[PDB]
A = this chain, B = another copy of it.
Amino acid sequence: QLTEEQIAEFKEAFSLFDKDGDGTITTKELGTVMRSLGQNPTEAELQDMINEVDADGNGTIDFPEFLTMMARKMKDTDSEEEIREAFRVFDKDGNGYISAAELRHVMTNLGEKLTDEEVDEMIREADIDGDGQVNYEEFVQMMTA
């Protein structure tokens, strides 16, 4: 299962937040780190963050709750990054939009056999705004659907 090294990493991460070493992360503490990371959350936003993982309802984050927070955020980050990189793969000219031409080319690269109608269908289904191209937001929706 868990390796000693893994646990060590999670302890180091927890300690970064748990400045006073009391074994809980407060809104105060969470905010301090978030600011170092270049964000500017309000108290209410910080409370919301905690509430998402606050299994015991005590209003602060303990170690197992922090592990849940990390498990979730790691998965989400990974997925988001994968999709973003894929978008960049498709958007060959870097203009922020996937054209039918671009989509056709990439599908061919990837060895997925498509008919003309199929590529069009694919674009049509993801194209919410009717411009006949797929922007990032659209691509994300297509991918999380």
Least Cβ distance of A81 to chain B in Å?
A: 9
**A36 near B88: Cβ-Cβ < 8 Å:** no
Q: Determine the chain B residues whose CB is within 8 A of the CB of A32 once the complex forms.
A: 109-110
Least Cβ distance of A115 to chain B in Å?
A: 18
**Number of chain A residues whose Cβ lies closer than 8 Å to a Cβ of chain B:** 16
Q: Determine the chain B residues whose CB is within 8 A of the CB of A38 once the complex forms.
A: 88-89, 92
Q: Determine the chain B residues whose CB is within 8 A of the CB of A92 once the complex forms.
A: 38
Q: Determine the chain B residues whose CB is within 8 A of the CB of A88 once the complex forms.
A: 38
Q: How many copies does the complex hold?
A: 2
Q: B15, B37, B111: which contacts A89 (Cβ < 8 A)?
A: B37
**A35 near B109: Cβ-Cβ < 8 Å:** yes
Least Cβ distance of A76 to chain B in Å?
A: 16
Report how far A89 CA is from B32 CA in the complex, Å.
Answer: 13
Report how far A109 CA is from B88 CA in the complex, Å.
Answer: 35
Does A33 make an interface contact (CB < 8 A)?
yes
Does A140 make an interface contact (CB < 8 A)?
no
Does A106 make an interface contact (CB < 8 A)?
yes
Binding site for B on A (CB under 8 A): 15-16, 19, 32-33, 35-38, 88-89, 92, 106, 109-111
